[PDB]
Amino acid sequence: PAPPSIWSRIVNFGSGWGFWVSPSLFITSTHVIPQGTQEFFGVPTKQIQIHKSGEFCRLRFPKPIRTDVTGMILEEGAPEGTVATLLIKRPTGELMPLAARMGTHATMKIQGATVGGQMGMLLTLGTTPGDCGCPYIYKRGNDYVVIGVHTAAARGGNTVICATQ
Ligand SMILES: CCOC(=O)CC[C@H](C[C@@H]1CCNC1=O)NC(=O)[C@@H](CC(=O)[C@@H](NC(=O)c1cc(C)on1)C(C)C)Cc1ccc(F)cc1
């Protein structure tokens, strides 16, 4: 499960979703970002500072946009064995948190491409196309930590991939 504040940060972004780590820090997947728009949330792309590390896409805006959200902790993956939660929203509005025991951090070969991220293993419906960009989060003490965004889900198994950095 997750609090309603963490869920509010997830917003539709092109083919998938994106997560407001802070009023001005927006993370998403490289596969889902729209490649034809010169504006994001009314802010010109010329003012936005984008840094991409594989399928992890980082958007820094000049001004704060979502002043309602507190700034969370963003880190490169979670300790091996950490049971994280994949907060995937669906178009219908249904909320579908999935429990995923994170695993090895590594550079992977996904469909002939190279992706830095962390493997995960879903526990006990599943992920689908249009889910990339949704965040992985786990609770550390009393603080919430986001570790990456969804990127792929190997077929013939419950292996999921959490792009990082
Ligand atoms: C093209 C449409 O694009 C989208 O809509 C993005 C959403 C889907 C969501 C998947 C979709 C289903 N369940 C899910 O969670 N993502 C992808 O399709 C990715 C490919 C896979 O998931 C493949 N996985 C692996 O190759 C793979 C290999 C290992 C190892 O782990 N995963 C296939 C499962 C489709 C796209 C991709 C390609 C090359 C990369 F560098 C990085 C990413």
Numbering used by the authors: 0 to 123, 132 to 172
Task: Provide the publication's sentences verbatim.
The protease plays a crucial role in viral replication by cleaving the polyprotein into individual nonstructural proteins. HuNoV proteases are cysteine proteases structurally similar to picornavirus 3C-like proteases with a chymotrypsin-like fold. Their active site features a catalytic triad with histidine-30 (H30) as the catalytic base, cysteine-139 (C139) as the catalytic nucleophile, and glutamic acid-54 (E54) as an acidic residue which orients and stabilizes the conformation of H30 (15).
Surprisingly, there is little change in backbone conformation between the respective rupintrivir-bound WT and R112A proteases of all GII strains. In GII.4-Pro HOV R112A, the rupintrivir-bound protease backbone shows the moderately open BII-CII loop position seen in rupintrivir-bound protease structures from other GI and GII strains, indicating that this is the most stable rupintrivir-bound conformation for HuNoV proteases. These highly similar backbones between WT and R112A mutant proteases, especially in the BII-CII loop, further confirm that the main cause for the lower potency of inhibitors against GII-Pro is the steric clash and subsequent unfavorable interaction of the P2, P3, and P4 residues with the BII-CII loop, rather than steric hindrance by the R112 sidechain alone. In addition, we observed increasing substrate affinity (decreasing Michaelis constant, KM) for all proteases, except for GII.3, which already has the lowest Michaelis constant. In addition, except in the case of GII.3-Pro, there was a reduction in the Michaelis constant (KM). Our structures of GII R112A proteases in complex with rupintrivir further show no significant changes in the protease backbone between rupintrivir-bound WT and R112A proteases. These results suggest that the differential placement of R112 in GII-Pros is not solely responsible for the observed potency difference.
